[PDB]
Structure formats: structure tokens, C-alpha cells
Short mmCIF file of C-alpha atoms and ligand atoms in Angstrom, two decimals:
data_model
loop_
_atom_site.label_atom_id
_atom_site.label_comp_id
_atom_site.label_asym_id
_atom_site.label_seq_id
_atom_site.Cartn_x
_atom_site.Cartn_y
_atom_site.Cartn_z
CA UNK A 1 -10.41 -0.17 -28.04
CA UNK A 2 -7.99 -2.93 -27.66
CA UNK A 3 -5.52 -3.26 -24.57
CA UNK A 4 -2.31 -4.39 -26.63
CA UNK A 5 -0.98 -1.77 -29.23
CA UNK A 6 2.93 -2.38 -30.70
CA UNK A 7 2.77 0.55 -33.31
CA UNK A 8 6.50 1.95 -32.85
CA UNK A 9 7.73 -1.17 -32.33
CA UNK A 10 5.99 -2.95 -35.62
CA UNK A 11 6.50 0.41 -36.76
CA UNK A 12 8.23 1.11 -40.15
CA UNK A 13 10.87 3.57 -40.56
CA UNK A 14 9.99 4.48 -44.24
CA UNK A 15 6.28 5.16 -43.39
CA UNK A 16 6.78 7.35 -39.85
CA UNK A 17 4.24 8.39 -38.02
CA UNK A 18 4.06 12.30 -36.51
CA UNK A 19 2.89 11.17 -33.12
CA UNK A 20 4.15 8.74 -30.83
CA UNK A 21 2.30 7.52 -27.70
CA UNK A 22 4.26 5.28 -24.94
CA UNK A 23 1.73 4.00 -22.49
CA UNK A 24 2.57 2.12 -19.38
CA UNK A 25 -0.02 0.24 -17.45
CA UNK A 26 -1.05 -0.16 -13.88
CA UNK A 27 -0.38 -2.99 -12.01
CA UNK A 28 -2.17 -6.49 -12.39
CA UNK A 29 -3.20 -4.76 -16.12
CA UNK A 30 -4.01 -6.33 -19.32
CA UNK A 31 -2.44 -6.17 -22.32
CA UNK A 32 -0.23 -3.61 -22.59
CA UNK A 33 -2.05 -0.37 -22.06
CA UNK A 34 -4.56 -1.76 -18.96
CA UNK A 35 -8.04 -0.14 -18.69
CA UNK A 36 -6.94 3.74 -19.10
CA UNK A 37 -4.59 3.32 -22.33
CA UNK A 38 -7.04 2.57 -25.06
CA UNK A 39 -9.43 5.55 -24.09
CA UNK A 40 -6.41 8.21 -24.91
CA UNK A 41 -5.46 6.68 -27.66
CA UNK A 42 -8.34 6.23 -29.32
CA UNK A 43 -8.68 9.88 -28.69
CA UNK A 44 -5.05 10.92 -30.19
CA UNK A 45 -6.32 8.97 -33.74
CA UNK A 46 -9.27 10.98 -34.16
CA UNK A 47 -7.35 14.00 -33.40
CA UNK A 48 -3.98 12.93 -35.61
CA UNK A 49 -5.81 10.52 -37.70
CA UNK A 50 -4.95 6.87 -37.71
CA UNK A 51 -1.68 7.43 -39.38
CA UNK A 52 -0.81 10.41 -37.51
CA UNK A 53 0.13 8.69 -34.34
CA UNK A 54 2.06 5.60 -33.26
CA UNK A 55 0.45 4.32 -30.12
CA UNK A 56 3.16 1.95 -27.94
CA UNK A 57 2.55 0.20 -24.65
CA UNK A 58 5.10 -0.43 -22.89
CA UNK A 59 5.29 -4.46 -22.43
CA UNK A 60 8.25 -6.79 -22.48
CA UNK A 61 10.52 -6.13 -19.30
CA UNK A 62 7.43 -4.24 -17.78
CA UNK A 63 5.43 -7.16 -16.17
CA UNK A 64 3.64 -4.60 -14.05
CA UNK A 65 4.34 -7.07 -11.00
CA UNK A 66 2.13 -5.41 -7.58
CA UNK A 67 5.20 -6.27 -5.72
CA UNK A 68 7.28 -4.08 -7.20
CA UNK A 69 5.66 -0.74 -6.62
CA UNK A 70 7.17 -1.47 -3.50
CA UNK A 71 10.86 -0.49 -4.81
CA UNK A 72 12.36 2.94 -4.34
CA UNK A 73 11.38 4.48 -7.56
CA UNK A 74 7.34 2.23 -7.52
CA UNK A 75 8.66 0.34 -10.17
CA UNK A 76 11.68 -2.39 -11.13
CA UNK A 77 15.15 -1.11 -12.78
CA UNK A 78 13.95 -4.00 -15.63
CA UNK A 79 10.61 -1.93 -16.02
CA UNK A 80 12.89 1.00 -16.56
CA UNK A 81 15.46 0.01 -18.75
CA UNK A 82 12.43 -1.72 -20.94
CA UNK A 83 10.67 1.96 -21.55
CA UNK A 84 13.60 3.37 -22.04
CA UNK A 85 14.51 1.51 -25.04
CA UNK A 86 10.97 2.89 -26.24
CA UNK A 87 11.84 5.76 -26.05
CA UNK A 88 15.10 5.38 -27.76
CA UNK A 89 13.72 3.10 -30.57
CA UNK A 90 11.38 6.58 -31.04
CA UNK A 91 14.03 8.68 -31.50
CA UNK A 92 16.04 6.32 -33.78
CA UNK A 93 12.78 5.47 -36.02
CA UNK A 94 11.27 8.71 -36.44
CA UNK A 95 13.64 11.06 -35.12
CA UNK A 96 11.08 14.04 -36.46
CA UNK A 97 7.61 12.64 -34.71
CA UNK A 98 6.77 14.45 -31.74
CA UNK A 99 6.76 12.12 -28.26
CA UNK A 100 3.96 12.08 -26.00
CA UNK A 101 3.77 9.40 -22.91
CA UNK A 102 1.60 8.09 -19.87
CA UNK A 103 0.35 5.98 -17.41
CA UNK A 104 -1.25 4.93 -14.63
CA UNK A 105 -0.30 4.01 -11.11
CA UNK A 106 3.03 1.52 -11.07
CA UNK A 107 2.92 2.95 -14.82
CA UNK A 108 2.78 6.52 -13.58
CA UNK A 109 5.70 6.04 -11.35
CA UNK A 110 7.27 4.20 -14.36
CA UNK A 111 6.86 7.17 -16.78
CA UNK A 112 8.09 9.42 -14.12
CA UNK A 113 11.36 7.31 -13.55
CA UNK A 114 11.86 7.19 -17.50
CA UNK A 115 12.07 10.26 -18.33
CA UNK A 116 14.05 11.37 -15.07
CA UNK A 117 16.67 9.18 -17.03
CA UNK A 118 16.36 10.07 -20.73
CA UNK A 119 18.79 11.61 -22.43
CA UNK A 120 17.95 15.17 -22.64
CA UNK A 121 17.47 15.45 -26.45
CA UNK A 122 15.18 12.42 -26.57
CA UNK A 123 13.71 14.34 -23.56
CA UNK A 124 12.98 17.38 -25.39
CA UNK A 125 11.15 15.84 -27.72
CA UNK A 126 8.52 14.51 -25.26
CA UNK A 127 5.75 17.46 -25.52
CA UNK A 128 3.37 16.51 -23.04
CA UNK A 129 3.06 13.87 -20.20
CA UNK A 130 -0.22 12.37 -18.51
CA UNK A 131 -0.30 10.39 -15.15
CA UNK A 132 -3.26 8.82 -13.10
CA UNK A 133 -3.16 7.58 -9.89
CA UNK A 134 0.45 8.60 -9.84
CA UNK A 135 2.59 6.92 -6.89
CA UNK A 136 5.26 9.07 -6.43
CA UNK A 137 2.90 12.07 -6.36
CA UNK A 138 3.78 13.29 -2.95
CA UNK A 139 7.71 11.85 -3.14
CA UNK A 140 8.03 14.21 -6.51
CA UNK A 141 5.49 17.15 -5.14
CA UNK A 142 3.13 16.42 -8.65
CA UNK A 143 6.37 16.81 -10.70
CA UNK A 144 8.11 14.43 -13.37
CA UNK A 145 12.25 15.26 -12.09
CA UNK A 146 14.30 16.85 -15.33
CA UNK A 147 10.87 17.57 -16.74
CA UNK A 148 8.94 20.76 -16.70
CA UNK A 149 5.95 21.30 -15.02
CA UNK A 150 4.10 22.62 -18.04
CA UNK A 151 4.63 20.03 -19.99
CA UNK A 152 3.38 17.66 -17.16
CA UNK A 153 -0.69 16.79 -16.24
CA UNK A 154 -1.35 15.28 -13.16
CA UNK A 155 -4.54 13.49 -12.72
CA UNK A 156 -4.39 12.49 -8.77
CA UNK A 157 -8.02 12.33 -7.27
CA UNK A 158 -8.81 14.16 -4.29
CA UNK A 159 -8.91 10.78 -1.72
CA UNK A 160 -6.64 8.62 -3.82
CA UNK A 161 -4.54 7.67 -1.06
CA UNK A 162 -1.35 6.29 -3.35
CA UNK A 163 -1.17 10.43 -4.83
CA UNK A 164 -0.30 11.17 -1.02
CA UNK A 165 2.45 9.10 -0.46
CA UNK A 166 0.35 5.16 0.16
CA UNK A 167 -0.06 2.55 -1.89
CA UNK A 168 -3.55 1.76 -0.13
CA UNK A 169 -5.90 1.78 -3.34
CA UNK A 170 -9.21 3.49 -2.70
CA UNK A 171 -12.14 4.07 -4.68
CA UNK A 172 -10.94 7.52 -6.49
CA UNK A 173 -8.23 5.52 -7.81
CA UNK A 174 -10.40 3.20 -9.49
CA UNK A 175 -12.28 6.68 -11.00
CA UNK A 176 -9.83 8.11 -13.68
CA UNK A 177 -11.88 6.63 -16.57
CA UNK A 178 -13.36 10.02 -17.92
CA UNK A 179 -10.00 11.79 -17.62
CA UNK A 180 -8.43 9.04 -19.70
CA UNK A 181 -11.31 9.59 -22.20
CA UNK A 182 -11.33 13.72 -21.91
CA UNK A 183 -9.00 15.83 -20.14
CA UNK A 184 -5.69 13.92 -20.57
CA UNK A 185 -6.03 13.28 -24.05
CA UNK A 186 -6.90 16.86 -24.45
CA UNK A 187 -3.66 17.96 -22.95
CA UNK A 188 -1.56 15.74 -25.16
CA UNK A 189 -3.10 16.60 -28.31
CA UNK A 190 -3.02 20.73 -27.10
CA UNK A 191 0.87 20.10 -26.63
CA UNK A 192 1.60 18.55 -29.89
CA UNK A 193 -0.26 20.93 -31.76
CA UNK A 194 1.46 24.04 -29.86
CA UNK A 195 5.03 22.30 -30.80
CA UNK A 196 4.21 21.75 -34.32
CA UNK A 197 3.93 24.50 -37.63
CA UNK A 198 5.13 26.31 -39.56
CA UNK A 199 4.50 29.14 -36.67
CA UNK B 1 -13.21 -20.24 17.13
CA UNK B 2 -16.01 -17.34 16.96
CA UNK B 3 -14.88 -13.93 15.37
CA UNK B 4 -16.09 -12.01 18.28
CA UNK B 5 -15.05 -11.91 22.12
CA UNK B 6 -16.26 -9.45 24.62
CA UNK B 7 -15.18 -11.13 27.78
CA UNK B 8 -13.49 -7.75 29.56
CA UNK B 9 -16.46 -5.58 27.99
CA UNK B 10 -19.19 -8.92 29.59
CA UNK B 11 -16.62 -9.49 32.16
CA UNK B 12 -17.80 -9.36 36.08
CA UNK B 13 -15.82 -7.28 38.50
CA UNK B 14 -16.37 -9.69 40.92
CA UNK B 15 -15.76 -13.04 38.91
CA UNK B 16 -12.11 -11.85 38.05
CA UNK B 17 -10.33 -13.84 35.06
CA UNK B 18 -6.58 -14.03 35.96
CA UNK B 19 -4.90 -13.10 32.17
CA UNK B 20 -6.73 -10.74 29.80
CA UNK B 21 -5.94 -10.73 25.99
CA UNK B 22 -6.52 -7.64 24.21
CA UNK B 23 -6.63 -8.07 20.28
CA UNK B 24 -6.52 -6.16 16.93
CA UNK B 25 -7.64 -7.45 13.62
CA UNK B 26 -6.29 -6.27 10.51
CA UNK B 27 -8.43 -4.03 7.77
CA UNK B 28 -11.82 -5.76 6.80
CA UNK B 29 -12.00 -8.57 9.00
CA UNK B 30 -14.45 -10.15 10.67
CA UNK B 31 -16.07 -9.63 14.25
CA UNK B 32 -13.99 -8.39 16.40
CA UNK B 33 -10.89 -10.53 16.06
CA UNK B 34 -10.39 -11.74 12.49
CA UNK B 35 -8.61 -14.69 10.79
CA UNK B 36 -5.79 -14.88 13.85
CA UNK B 37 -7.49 -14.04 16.82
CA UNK B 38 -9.70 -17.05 17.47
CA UNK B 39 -6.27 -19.71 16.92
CA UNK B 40 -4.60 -18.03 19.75
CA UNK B 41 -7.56 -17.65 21.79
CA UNK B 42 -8.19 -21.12 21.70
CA UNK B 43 -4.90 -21.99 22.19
CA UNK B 44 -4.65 -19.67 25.30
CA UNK B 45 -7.85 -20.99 26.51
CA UNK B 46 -5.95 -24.48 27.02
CA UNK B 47 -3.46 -23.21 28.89
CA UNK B 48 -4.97 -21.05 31.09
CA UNK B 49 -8.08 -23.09 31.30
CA UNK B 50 -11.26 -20.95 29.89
CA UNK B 51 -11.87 -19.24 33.55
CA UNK B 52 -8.05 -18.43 33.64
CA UNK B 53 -8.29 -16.04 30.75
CA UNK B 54 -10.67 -13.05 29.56
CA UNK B 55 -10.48 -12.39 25.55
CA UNK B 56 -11.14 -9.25 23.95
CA UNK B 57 -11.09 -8.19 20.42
CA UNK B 58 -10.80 -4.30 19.96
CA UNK B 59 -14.26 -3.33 18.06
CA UNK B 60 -16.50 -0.47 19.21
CA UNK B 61 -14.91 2.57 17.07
CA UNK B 62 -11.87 0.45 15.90
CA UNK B 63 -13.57 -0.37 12.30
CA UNK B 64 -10.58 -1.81 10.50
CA UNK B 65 -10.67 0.91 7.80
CA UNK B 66 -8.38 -0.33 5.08
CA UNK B 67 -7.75 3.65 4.15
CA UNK B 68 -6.39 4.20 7.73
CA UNK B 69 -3.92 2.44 7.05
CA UNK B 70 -2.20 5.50 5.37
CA UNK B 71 -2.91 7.60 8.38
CA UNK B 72 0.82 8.57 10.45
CA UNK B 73 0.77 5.90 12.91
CA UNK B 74 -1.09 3.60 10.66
CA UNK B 75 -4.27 3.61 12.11
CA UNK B 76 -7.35 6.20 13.07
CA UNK B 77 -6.86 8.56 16.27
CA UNK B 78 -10.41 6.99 17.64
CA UNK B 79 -9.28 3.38 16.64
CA UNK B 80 -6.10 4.01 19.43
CA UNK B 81 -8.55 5.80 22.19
CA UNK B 82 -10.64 2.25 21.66
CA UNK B 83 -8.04 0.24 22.28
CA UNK B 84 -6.33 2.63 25.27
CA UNK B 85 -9.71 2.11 26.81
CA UNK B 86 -9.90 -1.34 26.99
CA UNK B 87 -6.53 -1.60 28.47
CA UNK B 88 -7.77 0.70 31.48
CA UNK B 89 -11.26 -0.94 31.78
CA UNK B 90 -9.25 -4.30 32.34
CA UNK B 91 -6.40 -2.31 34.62
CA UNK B 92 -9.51 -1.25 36.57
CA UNK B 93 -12.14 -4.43 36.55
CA UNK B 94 -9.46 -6.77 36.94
CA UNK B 95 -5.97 -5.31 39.08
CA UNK B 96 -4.68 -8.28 39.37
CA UNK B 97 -5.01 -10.10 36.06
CA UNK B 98 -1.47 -9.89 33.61
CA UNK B 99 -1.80 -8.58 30.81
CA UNK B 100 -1.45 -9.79 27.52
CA UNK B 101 -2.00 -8.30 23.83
CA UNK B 102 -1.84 -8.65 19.64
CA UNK B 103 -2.64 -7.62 16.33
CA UNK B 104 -2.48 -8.47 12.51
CA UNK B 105 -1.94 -5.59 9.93
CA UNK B 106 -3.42 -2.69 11.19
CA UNK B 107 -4.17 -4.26 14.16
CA UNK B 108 -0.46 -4.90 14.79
CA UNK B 109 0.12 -0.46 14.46
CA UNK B 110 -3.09 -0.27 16.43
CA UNK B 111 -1.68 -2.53 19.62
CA UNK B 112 2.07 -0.63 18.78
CA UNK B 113 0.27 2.76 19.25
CA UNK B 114 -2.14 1.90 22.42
CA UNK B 115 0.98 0.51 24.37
CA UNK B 116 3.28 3.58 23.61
CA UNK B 117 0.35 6.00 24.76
CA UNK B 118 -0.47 3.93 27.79
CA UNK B 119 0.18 4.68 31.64
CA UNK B 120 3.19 3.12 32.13
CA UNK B 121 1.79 1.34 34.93
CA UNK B 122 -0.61 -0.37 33.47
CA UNK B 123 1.99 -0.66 29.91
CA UNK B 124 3.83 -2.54 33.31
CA UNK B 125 0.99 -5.38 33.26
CA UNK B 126 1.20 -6.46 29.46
CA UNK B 127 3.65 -9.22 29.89
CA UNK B 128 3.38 -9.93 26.17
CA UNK B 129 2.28 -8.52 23.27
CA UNK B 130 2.48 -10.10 19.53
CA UNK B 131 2.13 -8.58 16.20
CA UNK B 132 1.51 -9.91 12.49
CA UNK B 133 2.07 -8.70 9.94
CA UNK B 134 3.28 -5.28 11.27
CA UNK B 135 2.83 -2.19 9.25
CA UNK B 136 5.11 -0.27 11.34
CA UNK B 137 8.04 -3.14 11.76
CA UNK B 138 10.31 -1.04 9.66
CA UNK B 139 9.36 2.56 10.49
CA UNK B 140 9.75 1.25 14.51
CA UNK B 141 12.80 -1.51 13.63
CA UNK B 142 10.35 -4.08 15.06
CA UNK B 143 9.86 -2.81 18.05
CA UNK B 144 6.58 -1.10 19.97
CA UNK B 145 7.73 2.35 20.93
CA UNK B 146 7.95 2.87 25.14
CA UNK B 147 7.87 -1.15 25.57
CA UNK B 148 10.38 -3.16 25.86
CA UNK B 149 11.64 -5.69 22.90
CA UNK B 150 11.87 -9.03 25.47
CA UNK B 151 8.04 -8.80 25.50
CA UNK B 152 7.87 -8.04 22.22
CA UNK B 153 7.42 -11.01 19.41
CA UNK B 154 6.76 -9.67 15.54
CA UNK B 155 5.77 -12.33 13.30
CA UNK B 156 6.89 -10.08 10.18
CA UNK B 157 7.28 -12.87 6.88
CA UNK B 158 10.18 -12.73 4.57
CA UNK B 159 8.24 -10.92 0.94
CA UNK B 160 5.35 -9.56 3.20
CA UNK B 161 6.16 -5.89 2.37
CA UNK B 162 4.13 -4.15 5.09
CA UNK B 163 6.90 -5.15 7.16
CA UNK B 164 9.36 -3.76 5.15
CA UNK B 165 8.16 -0.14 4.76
CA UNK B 166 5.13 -0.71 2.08
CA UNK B 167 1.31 -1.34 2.41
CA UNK B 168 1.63 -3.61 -0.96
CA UNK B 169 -0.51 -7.19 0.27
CA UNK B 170 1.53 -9.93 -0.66
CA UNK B 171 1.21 -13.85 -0.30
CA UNK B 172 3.48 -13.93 2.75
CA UNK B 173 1.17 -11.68 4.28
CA UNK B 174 -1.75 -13.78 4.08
CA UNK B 175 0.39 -16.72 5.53
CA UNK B 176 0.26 -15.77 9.64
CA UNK B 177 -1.95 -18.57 10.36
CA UNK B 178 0.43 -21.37 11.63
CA UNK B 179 2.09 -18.67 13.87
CA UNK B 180 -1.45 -17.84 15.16
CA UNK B 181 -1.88 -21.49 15.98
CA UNK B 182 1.64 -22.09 17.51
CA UNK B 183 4.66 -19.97 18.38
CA UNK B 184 2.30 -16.58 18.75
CA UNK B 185 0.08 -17.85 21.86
CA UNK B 186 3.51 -20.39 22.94
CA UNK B 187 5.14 -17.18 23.71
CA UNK B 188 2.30 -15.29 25.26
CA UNK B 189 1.29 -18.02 27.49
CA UNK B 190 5.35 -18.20 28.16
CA UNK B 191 5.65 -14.47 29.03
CA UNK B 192 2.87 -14.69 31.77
CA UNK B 193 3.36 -18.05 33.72
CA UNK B 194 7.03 -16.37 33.72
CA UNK B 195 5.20 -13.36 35.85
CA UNK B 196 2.96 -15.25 37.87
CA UNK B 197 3.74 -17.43 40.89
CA UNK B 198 5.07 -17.43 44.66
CA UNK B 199 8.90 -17.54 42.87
CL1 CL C 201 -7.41 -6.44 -3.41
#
């Protein structure tokens, strides 16, 4: 349960993993995958196995400034660029591992804003989503734009004030703790599963 | 400097003060009027003498709820009947007195709120009303809606993003106490010796 995890990016293209997990962080948050992060991927490696999952914060550019939630997408252009290249380094890596991302808050925004601008192959390959606390909520009507709904779980607490268009933080906010540790991972590991086989 | 002033609420019909100052606080604070209010009471108290002016925080069902904030006009329905009230119980105690008024944060969408639902006659008495840290600067274009912008004066500090269309708390936000202390009561005092006299 540690808060910093580089797997794709001290990854190793001749021993790929089949799961990839990009992670970005609320604001203020340590490491690279905050409080949430370590919860859902601890969960992904005893459902893929150790091996079977790369698990990748996303730090660098991404200084998950308060500030900058303030911006029109809830997060900077930097922050952006910085998970795209994540994404990307995925794809070029292990261009057969399947992509799952998250996170929470400024994160969630970031995820959303991501993927908006992913090519649409790399795109594809993204099987499932989570976001907590997500900012843009109520600007996106629960939705990830150029991303399908069903491949997208909201967690946005009833009384979370920033999942209805704020950025006041109240207590339900603070609360997503068990999703991060049940239901989300749950969703990204039910995805995966459902895109891989021999079927 | 106490946080709490009921001089209109204690005040006596009969021993009129000549200027009362109606005040808002912003989400959390203390008493009735907060980090700001006492440094321009104090200051007005000087200049009017402390029998020249009656000062009045806005408490009673104003509670400075941080998550009202996120309400439409940025603060509770009940919060702007408490403060509407206190304008009329000094329009009707005191008919004479000039009118003066402020708020930080909320406080500042609070007073903004009050004074565009006021009578216009008594709206007529307030010859000066400032705001800090105004949640509503952008969403108005610093001005109080129904009131006109030469009695206006928004202390609204470059990087305090409530000002500039978020509710994100920044350093510059925390910063309004040297205009509190100076320029804030300098051009309240200013607005209402400019109202009174034979002329
Ligand atoms: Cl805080």
C-alpha cells in the first residue's frame, strides 16, 4: 500500500505486463497515487496477479497544484500533456496489455481531459475508467467526452458539492475510501476480463 | 476589536446613532463579524466617534455555511432574509441614519444579494457598501446587481480565484486584512460625510 508506483514507466518492454493502471491523484496528494490509488491497485494484483498488471501514477508534469482546478478543463494543459505521454508510452511498450485508468478529484477531471484527447486507437484500448469526486461531473453530465458511457464508473457522492458543478469540498468527498477498495476496482477488473479470451 | 456587534439589534429607538454598518463574514468565522469586520469597525468608530455609528454583524440565521457557498447566489435563501431584515430594522429604528455595508467571501454574495432584493428606498440610504473577497465579482463583473458601481468598492486580489469565477481558497484570499484596516473603512467613511451636511 504505497502512494508512489512507476511500473510502466520502469517498466520493461521484453517482460510486459497484461494490465496497465494510470492513476492520477487529487489535489495536495502524496506520492503519486494520493489516498484512493493504492486501495485499487492493490486490488487489480490480487485479481491479475503481481505480474499481471502495471500500476502507473501519473507524476512528473502533474503537480496536482489546488490552484489549478480552477482552469477550464480542473486541471493544467502541463498536467495533460504529462498523462498523455502515459498513455502513449502504454501503447508503445506493450501495445497488447489492456488499459485501465482513474482518479480522484483534480485527477478525475485530469483523466477525463486525457482521454477526451487520446488518439482514438490508444483510446480503444482503455477498457474501463473510474472517477471519485469527479469535478467536471455536472460540466460533462457523469460522462468522460469521446468515451462511452459503459466503459465509464462514476463514483460522485450524493452531497459532494464539486460532482455538482463547485469546488467547495464537503465531507462525502472525503468518503470514497470503500469504493476505492470495492466497487471501482470491481468494475475495472469486470472490464478487462470481458475484453480479454479466447471468447 | 470583539467578533460580535449587535448595536442596531441593542440599539435604542430613541438614542439614534447617525451611520449604521451592516456586515457579513465569510464561511466559518467567528462571532458575528469575522477576521475583517472588527478593523473597519474600529476604524469607523474614529471617525464617526463611537456614538456617531451603530455596528452590526449579520448572525441570527446567517451561519456562514461553507457548503452554501455553492448555492446560485452564493449564499442560503434564509442567510439573505437575515440580512434584508436588518437593513429594514435600521431603515425603521433609525430614518435618519446613512447607511453603510460589507462582506468577506460569502459575506461579500450575502451583502450583493440583500442590496439587489432591497426596497429601493431604503437600497437609497446605503451610501457605501464594500466587499472582499467577492464570490460573485466575476459572475456580476464586480458590481452588486440594482446598486450603483460609485458606491460600490470590491477589494477582489490578483490569484484570489473566488473573484475570478472559482471557490478554490488561495493565499491572496486570506490577504484582505490591510484593506480592512485602511482603504475599505477610508472609502466608507468617504461615501457618507459626502451625503451628510447643510451643503
Ligand atoms: Cl481547507
Amino acid at each position: 500500500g504505497r502512494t508512489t508506483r512507476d511500473d510502466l514507466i520502469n517498466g520493461n518492454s521484453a517482460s510486459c505486463a497484461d494490465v496497465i493502471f494510470i492513476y492520477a491523484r487529487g489535489s495536495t496528494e502524496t506520492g503519486n497515487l494520493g489516498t484512493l490509488g493504492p486501495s485499487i491497485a492493490s486490488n487489480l494484483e490480487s485479481a491479475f496477479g503481481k505480474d499481471g498488471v502495471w500500476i502507473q501514477g501519473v507524476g512528473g508534469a502533474y503537480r496536482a497544484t489546488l490552484g489549478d482546478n480552477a482552469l477550464p478543463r480542473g486541471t493544467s494543459s502541463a498536467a495533460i500533456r504529462e498523462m498523455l505521454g502515459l498513455f502513449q508510452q502504454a501503447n508503445t511498450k506493450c501495445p497488447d496489455a489492456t488499459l485501465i485508468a482513474g482518479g480522484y478529484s483534480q485527477g478525475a477531471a485530469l483523466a477525463a481531459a486525457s482521454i477526451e484527447d487520446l488518439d482514438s486507437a490508444i483510446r480503444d484500448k482503455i477498457a474501463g475508467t473510474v472517477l471519485f469526486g469527479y469535478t467536471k461531473n455536472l460540466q460533462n453530465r457523469g460522462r468522460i467526452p469521446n468515451y462511452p458511457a459503459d466503459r465509464t464508473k462514476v463514483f460522485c457522492k450524493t452531497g459532494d458539492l464539486v460532482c455538482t458543478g463547485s469546488l467547495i469540498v464537503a465531507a462525502p468527498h472525503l468518503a470514497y475510501g470503500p469504493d476505492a477498495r470495492g466497487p471501482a476496482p470491481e468494475f475495472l477488473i469486470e472490464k478487462v476480463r470481458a475484453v480479454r479470451g479466447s471468447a
